[PDB]
Design a binder for this molecule. Sequence first.
Ligand code: MG
Ligand code: MG
Ligand code: MG
Ligand code: MG
Ligand code: MG
Ligand code: MG
Ligand code: MG
Ligand code: MG
Ligand code: MG
Ligand code: MG
Ligand code: MG
Ligand code: MG
Ligand code: MG
Ligand code: MG
Ligand code: MG
Ligand code: MG
Ligand code: MG
Ligand code: MG
Ligand code: MG
Ligand code: MG
Ligand code: ZN
Lengths: 102, 57, 69, 155, 31, 50
Amino acid sequence: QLLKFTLDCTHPVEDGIMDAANFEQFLQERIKVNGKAGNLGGGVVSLERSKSKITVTSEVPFSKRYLKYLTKKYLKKNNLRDWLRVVANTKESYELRYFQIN
Amino acid sequence: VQRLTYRRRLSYNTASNKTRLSRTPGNRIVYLYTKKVGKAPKSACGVCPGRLRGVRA
Amino acid sequence: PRKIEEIKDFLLTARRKDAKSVKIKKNKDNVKFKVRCSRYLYTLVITDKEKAEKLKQSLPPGLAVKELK
Amino acid sequence: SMLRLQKRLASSVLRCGKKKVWLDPNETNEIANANSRQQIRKLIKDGLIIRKPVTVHSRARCRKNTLARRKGRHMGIGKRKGTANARMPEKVTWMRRMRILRRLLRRYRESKKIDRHMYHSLYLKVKGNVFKNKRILMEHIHKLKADKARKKLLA
Amino acid sequence: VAKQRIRMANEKHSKNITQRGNVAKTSRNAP
Amino acid sequence: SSHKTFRIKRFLAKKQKQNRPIPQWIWMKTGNKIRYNSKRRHWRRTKLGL
RNA sequence: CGCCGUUCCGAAGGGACGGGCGAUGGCCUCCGUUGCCCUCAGCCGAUCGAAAGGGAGUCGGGUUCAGAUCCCCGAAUCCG
RNA sequence: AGUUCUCUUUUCUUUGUGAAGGGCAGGGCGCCCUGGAAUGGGUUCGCCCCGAGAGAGGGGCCCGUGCCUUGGAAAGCGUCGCGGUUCCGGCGGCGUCCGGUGAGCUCUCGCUGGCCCUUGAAAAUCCGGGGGAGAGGGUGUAAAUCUCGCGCCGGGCCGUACCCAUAUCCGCAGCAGGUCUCCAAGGUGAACAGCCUCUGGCAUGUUGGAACAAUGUAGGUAAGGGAAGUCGGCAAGCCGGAUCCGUAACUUCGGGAUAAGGAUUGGCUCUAAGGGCUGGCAGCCGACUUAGAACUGGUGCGGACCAGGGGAAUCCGACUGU
Ligand SMILES: [Mg+2]
Ligand SMILES: [Mg+2]
Ligand SMILES: [Mg+2]
Ligand SMILES: [Mg+2]
Ligand SMILES: [Mg+2]
Ligand SMILES: [Mg+2]
Ligand SMILES: [Mg+2]
Ligand SMILES: [Mg+2]
Ligand SMILES: [Mg+2]
Ligand SMILES: [Mg+2]
Ligand SMILES: [Mg+2]
Ligand SMILES: [Mg+2]
Ligand SMILES: [Mg+2]
Ligand SMILES: [Mg+2]
Ligand SMILES: [Mg+2]
Ligand SMILES: [Mg+2]
Ligand SMILES: [Mg+2]
Ligand SMILES: [Mg+2]
Ligand SMILES: [Mg+2]
Ligand SMILES: [Mg+2]
Ligand SMILES: [Zn+2]
């Protein structure tokens, strides 16, 4: 069947702290299917972006937490993990939030 | 892992202190105290070694 | 606790003098009608929503009714 | 102040050890005047008392090693300390073989590949250690069936 | 409650080394 | 121990009440000589024997 | 002062289904109670002796500064 | 939630359902009925079973602490978000999911055996049966009667805190002593051994600082020699695991025996054998083992820990035990 997951970075991108397109590119070149990070398993995992939300669809098994594993990884690359937090918004969405600081 | 304690003051492993584990709705293992195992009646013939049927043990 | 299978015997159990109140619990798959008698909490498990409303309106008068959420 | 009490009650409310209770070092005055579990529950909700995570004890090292052992690594003559029987008792090895070989004969008899007369003869040979494993037994049954079939033809 | 708050408060408390003798009793000034 | 008899628990209680300091007004009585309760007991220093 | 002894040199049962007599009662109809008599009765050893032996029947959730299978909420059960 | 310089679809945490009732798995039967078995068959790890009735069919019963169900999601927990007096059993959102595997360990249920010149409590208490003295009513508003299902009332007295032990107990004490028990994680490993670690706990054991003389106490190492020391090899030291081989005198034939004496042991990459489920074949699942081979390092490899020195004799006492 079809498994659909989304990432909500609206709050940071609206603050101009991360770019969706740069994030979008990162996912394309990393998402591993059968341990291959190049071809998205042969287009089986399609990655579609919106204005501030990135959606990932896979016709094969694909863990939601895997998106959390890469998302946090990408945040550390950009030295954002000390500000942003990845939380699940629903059964199929993660969103990025701010720690309650001042 | 979680380790158990007796729920009574009898701290010895006697024949009247046997227990069994039980997971509760609160998601913890406790001790429940079993009742002794009953025995069906033996035949009055004093010969047949088996116990009687149709009777609660 | 006792489980009741038929509506007929639930209605009767609600008419016992020792029935104190009826608890109506709605789940995603069924509606449970639980009545507290002297000894047991009898339950009627209803899988049809329509039958539930018909029953709720026909309980004996004077039995305390509580809806549970 | 002296937060021995708050450490004790927070541990009881959090259902963890006193070693996992964390008190905000910047708020000891607020915590100091929490002398009840109702107030401790409020400080827990507020975030002046938190439960520290379990210390990491990862099995990754032994999971990696156990995978190596399944391929034969770290299992040579120099890595054994108990006798061969202690590592794998003979009785258990015998028990597995007997159950396997009797299961085969039972199924072969039921499927009428052998008759009850050949089964009984083979059952007592199996008990005699004649056949080392399943395959050796199955080949012998094949050889027996052919010689019997030849005799049937000659009759 | 977010668990990273444990780190944040610990590091903040470790900053008291420079302000010995005038440590603010409560940082949550409101109330 | 926890397992106690009524007689023992009662004898213990009387020992509990005797173990207190004197009233301070006792000092101001006319012919008074007592300065402190000289019959105080500690559960560790000296034992009851029962 | 006492000791021995524990069924041994003992008239060691105060009980009962039922039956017969009276006396009392009350939902005075008839049933109860009570006293006497008839009948039936081995136990054969008073009593003590175990917070590990035998021995019916309670579990879940919450709750305290300190008590909880004991308090509260709920759901059960044994005995009489 | 942690790490993310690089790598890691990664590592860690967590992922409920009580008693009682019902239903159903599963286990057990020295229970029944048909029937009549040698070309004897059935069967276990071992056994053991049968004309006094086996195999094969079809049934009955006991325990079901296992799963489902009423309990019961309302509760609990995980997590994110809002509230309040804010010391509220506060309120919401989502979740509380699916499989596998084992001579694994702990408890328990059961079947079958072995040991005894050892045979491994009693009573309270409760139950069934045999018997048939009696009782009940004359066709009914039926009666005596009921161990059935509901309903009604009550359960008095005493104990209960905490310590339970390198500081709550006994040793004059917060004494390295003594003092009965239950539960029991990961790795290595034969292992409840030793070594490291998680949960939980602790603050080095009635003080600290600075030095690093002698003499000590406890640990080590020593060229060449190797008991020359000493009453005496005291003390220390050698050996030590496991696999393969080999093994004397004597013997009460059981032993002696790990006799004695050798070889091997790492890491890495492979090969072969050892199974279940489904429908001499095909597919899918698997759990640890054993054996062999190549390559490889400064010959190091039971790398720490754990871990027998051996032989030839004499005296005494058979041995185990005290
Ligand atoms: Mg007892
Ligand atoms: Mg259960
Ligand atoms: Mg053997
Ligand atoms: Mg003392
Ligand atoms: Mg007793
Ligand atoms: Mg048969
Ligand atoms: Mg819930
Ligand atoms: Mg009869
Ligand atoms: Mg207590
Ligand atoms: Mg020291
Ligand atoms: Mg010190
Ligand atoms: Mg000390
Ligand atoms: Mg000292
Ligand atoms: Mg030397
Ligand atoms: Mg030398
Ligand atoms: Mg000499
Ligand atoms: Mg000399
Ligand atoms: Mg020596
Ligand atoms: Mg010898
Ligand atoms: Mg001797
Ligand atoms: Zn019989």
